[PDB]
Write a protein that binds this ligand. Structure first.
Ligand code: NA
Ligand SMILES: [Zn+2]
Lengths: 167, 167, 167
């Protein structure tokens, strides 16, 4: 049936897809690691320079990955321990340089100091991301979510936090 | 040594395996997303028409994916927030159209209304699934588990749930 | 441009990388499953015979996978329910037989009996592992971490544990 050339072409396309899926999984992994490590300069490298600006009365218009990370740093201050835990991705490669990804998030936040001292926040969400490939590298272009649930409460003050990377 | 044809054949087999593993990971991802989103019609599409009926005095015999989802809907009512979080899969492709998968589950359930209002249930489990491929698509054929642990308790009624997709 | 031989060689290298990444993901999955199942003999099979001995005044020098599992068994006794939950791996294949992996850990520990009866411990950590390939199989060579946070507390004694695989 098919020539060797045709069989090779098909393999090259299939492998490129698998390589792209794996790169996008590591991209999102790096995003969560840097977000929760508060490694803002490194986090910035996961964001597309063309990161999508979702339009709405009262929301911010971001002009750059740097502005996005300035917002995240303000939203995730030193006093806030965060864990953003990604599960069970569904990655679809839409074209040579675009992709979509679903991620199942669990998040746990603990405020250790300041106005929200001893507040805990837990929740879950289904994210839907868009990614884009620029010069052989994948970036996050747009990231949105539907909350499963979210809750807040006061932690028992007797809970002993014995390690905190942000201290 | 090997002819180009032989090297290509080997690549085609290896790539088919990786494609099948990735499809099975996205299959199980879709299962959890739809289960926790209570998207029962969509959940049904993840189940094999030949879904295995585990025989035991007092258990139900399912005749179709639809009957399985009717049971799940009764087991996971609107008043129950659920998170079924899959980790660290071990997927083995057993033949061209069959596979086995191990998944590490964490689950968190919260009842918001009705008889179990303010009950929380947490646990963990090791699942072992069987999958089957029909017309180029993977389906869940059988799904079983060993519980690591399970616990229940009354939640502090002062916990503020601020978002709930089921409301 | 490239000969068919060159295109095949490239595919073989790319596929070997993807196969190695998937094998390393299943390796770490098996590690967590056996650690939390307290399946010490099986856990041992995930560890390199050349498992790295991190040098420090007061620490143990391990001579074998078996000694490592003896330590883990002492550190994770029957009375301790553990869940070590791996997320969002970043696996890099460094050479034909070496690799590095980042994993995002959440851990939850519950003591059911003995000196720490009713103690809970929760936390998170970023692991950085080294792996090595011996006779076609990947093994864990070195495993280290930075804690995000760790906390301990007394559980409400009214929490009903209804299943425990270690009982
Ligand atoms: Na959790
Ligand atoms: Zn998790």
């Amino acid at each position: 049936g098919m020539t060797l050339e045709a069989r090779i072409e098909a393999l090259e396309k299939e492998i490129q897809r698998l390589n792209d899926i794996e790169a996008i999984k590591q991209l999102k992994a790096k995003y969560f690691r840097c977000l929760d490590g508060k490694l803002w300069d490194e986090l910035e490298t996961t964001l597309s320079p063309n990161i999508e600006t979702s339009y709405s009365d009262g929301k911010l218009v971001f002009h750059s990955p740097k502005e996005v990370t300035e917002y995240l740093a303000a939203a995730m201050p030193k006093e806030e321990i965060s864990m953003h835990m990604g599960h069970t991705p569904e990655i679809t490669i839409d074209s040579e340089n675009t992709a979509t990804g679903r991620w199942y998030l669990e998040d746990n936040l603990i405020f250790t100091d300041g106005k929200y001292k001893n507040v805990g926040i837990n929740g879950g969400a289904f994210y839907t991301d868009k990614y884009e490939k620029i010069d052989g590298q994948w970036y996050i272009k747009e990231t949105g979510y539907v909350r499963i649930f979210e809750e807040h409460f006061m932690r028992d003050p007797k809970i002993h936090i014995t390690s905190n990377m942000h201290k």
